[PDB]
Amino acid sequence: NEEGITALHNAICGANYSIVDFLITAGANVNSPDSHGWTPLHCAASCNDTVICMALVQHGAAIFATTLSDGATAFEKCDPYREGYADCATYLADVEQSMGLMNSGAVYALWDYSAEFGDELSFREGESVTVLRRDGPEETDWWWAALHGQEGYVPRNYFGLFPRVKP
Amino acid sequence: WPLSSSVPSQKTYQGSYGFRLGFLHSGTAKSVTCTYSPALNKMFCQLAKTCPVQLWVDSTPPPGTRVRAMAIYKQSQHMTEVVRRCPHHERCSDSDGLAPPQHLIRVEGNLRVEYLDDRNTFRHSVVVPYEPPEVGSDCTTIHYNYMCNSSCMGGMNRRPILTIITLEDSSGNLLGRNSFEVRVCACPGRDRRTEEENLRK
Ligand SMILES: [Zn+2]
């Protein structure tokens, strides 16, 4: 609509779990941003809705995606004034840390990417990438990774813990 | 009813063919039909509704391969008890003409379905031929139906069950094995939602 709001976005804030699941399974873009840069994950977090967050994460949510307005991540949008804050924040915090560690360090590209530099790695949406070096202190925004034998740096915000739903 | 003298394995085993499972959700828009929870490894489904289970393999097993499904109680103390339909459901008029009235698990959409009451273990199971995925598909989908509610007195009576899926050759020898918990209920979406909330505690 005029506000960048999609069908998925509306179901989330209204806590209409049945519609959300249907849309996700149908291949609804779990990362579509509204006028303010809010993705479905950002809305779910602001409602502290852990169940929805999980469904989104498990279906290709960009954990490190940031909003246009305050440049915050979903984790940072959790509302400590509403119930369920602790549970949701904890889940998202654990989700962030599990990336490049769980599932044998494997993460899923959520977007096509053309390297800008030879020391960077190029990849297509949906491909599985192994994170070799996560916690490099000198670069909090990139990971050393491997795809089809090739090693290079990749942007953290281009990955999900799970892959997108293809239609 | 006689108790089994043994308990089938629920050990995950990908085998030489890299056999694993995948799941779908059947929910018709607002109506939450059958939903799977990755975090819980648990399927929530409605009685007699389509329950898609996906077979994923790394490479193709030989022709004549078969796929078997069997339910067991999840709790150690109930494991020897054969999972079967309650008196009410066993007697109700919901036959498809192929499945034994006592069997919990049916397969829909396959006229080569075969059912077994094991003479030795007493366990019920259902088996179909393995078919490779359709063109443009990455997996083989089997449509299961569960014919009794978790809450049925005289049946499961609120005791959790696991479904064990095995891949076998034409002779019955094991090729791969996987399993998942199952709750058959009236509102699978709500129950899944609720159980994940409680786990986070
Ligand atoms: Zn029953």
Side-chain angles (χ1 to χ4, degrees):
Chain A
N1 65 4
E2 266 179 305
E3 287 288 71
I5 297 168
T6 65
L8 187 55
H9 280 89
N10 286 345
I12 289 175
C13 55
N16 299 295
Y17 305 96
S18 310
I19 290 77
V20 169
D21 301 318
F22 174 68
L23 296 172
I24 288 177
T25 300
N29 182 352
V30 305
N31 296 128
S32 38
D34 62 16
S35 64
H36 285 45
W38 285 49
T39 65
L41 191 63
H42 284 113
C43 316
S46 74
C47 299
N48 297 332
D49 202 311
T50 310
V51 174
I52 295 298
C53 289
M54 292 170 60
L56 292 172
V57 170
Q58 293 157 37
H59 295 82
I63 317 309
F64 298 99
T66 56
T67 54
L68 295 172
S69 39
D70 187 8
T73 63
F75 172 78
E76 306 173 275
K77 278 288 159 66
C78 292
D79 198 352
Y81 289 79
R82 301 170 169 158
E83 65 164 39
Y85 170 77
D87 287 351
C88 199
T90 285
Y91 170 67
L92 293 180
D94 191 51
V95 156
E96 291 199 352
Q97 292 306 83
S98 69
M99 286 197 74
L101 164 59
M102 285 309 294
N103 195 39
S104 301
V107 289
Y108 298 88
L110 300 182
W111 297 353
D112 293 327
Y113 180 62
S114 304
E116 284 174 51
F117 296 105
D119 73 325
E120 285 171 10
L121 200 65
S122 176
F123 54 81
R124 304 303 92 179
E125 181 284 332
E127 295 185 306
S128 176
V129 174
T130 306
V131 177
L132 305 177
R133 293 182 294 158
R134 268 180 62 192
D135 305 312
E138 302 298 321
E139 209 64 75
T140 50
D141 296 306
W142 295 75
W143 289 325
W144 189 249
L147 169 53
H148 298 168
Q150 290 299 320
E151 290 180 23
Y153 281 117
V154 294
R156 299 199 304 178
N157 68 305
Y158 270 54
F159 300 90
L161 195 55
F162 294 81
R164 279 175 185 273
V165 180
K166 309 285 134 211
Chain B
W1 292 104
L3 294 159
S4 189
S5 55
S6 62
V7 183
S9 166
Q10 69 277 38
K11 182 59 192 311
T12 292
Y13 171 51
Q14 302 193 347
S16 306
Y17 301 103
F19 172 50
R20 65 250 181 246
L21 298 180
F23 301 88
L24 175 64
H25 315 110
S26 315
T28 60
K30 62 159 175 284
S31 297
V32 292
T33 289
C34 181
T35 183
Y36 175 75
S37 166
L40 296 168
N41 187 33
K42 187 172 179 170
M43 175 180 295
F44 295 78
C45 69
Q46 291 184 325
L47 196 150
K49 298 306 181 190
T50 305
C51 297
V53 173
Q54 299 170 346
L55 318 177
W56 292 68
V57 294
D58 284 334
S59 62
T60 315
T65 292
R66 309 219 296 162
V67 183
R68 189 177 299 275
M70 174 179 284
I72 59 165
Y73 289 110
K74 178 172 189 278
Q75 295 162 306
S76 55
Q77 63 273 28
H78 302 297
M79 283 191 167
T80 56
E81 182 177 331
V82 178
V83 179
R84 55 175 61 261
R85 297 179 80 184
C86 71
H88 168 59
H89 282 119
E90 175 182 344
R91 292 176 204 277
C92 72
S93 299
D94 66 5
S95 183
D96 67 348
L98 302 180
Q102 301 175 352
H103 281 214
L104 180 63
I105 309 177
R106 301 182 180 180
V107 166
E108 61 173 82
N110 193 325
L111 275 293
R112 291 179 301 168
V113 67
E114 166 185 326
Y115 290 94
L116 174 69
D117 296 341
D118 191 295
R119 282 155 59 180
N120 307 137
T121 70
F122 303 137
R123 302 290 182 177
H124 295 168
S125 61
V126 56
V127 61
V128 291
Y130 168 84
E131 293 294 355
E134 295 304 321
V135 171
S137 189
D138 290 321
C139 63
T140 296
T141 299
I142 301 183
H143 294 160
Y144 290 105
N145 296 156
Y146 290 80
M147 304 302 299
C148 181
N149 280 123
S150 294
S151 58
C152 287
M153 271 230 67
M156 286 179 282
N157 188 29
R158 300 169 185 281
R159 298 172 294 176
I161 55 160
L162 312 172
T163 297
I164 304 172
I165 301 304
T166 51
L167 203 63
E168 304 173 329
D169 66 16
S170 56
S171 160
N173 305 305
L174 173 69
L175 298 176
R177 187 195 301 103
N178 284 281
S179 58
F180 53 96
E181 186 169 345
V182 187
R183 179 181 178 86
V184 184
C185 50
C187 193
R190 191 161 166 82
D191 285 351
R192 179 182 58 73
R193 198 174 302 167
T194 287
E195 289 196 14
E196 297 169 355
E197 144 83 328
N198 291 339
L199 177 64
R200 282 285 164 283
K201 297 178 181 180

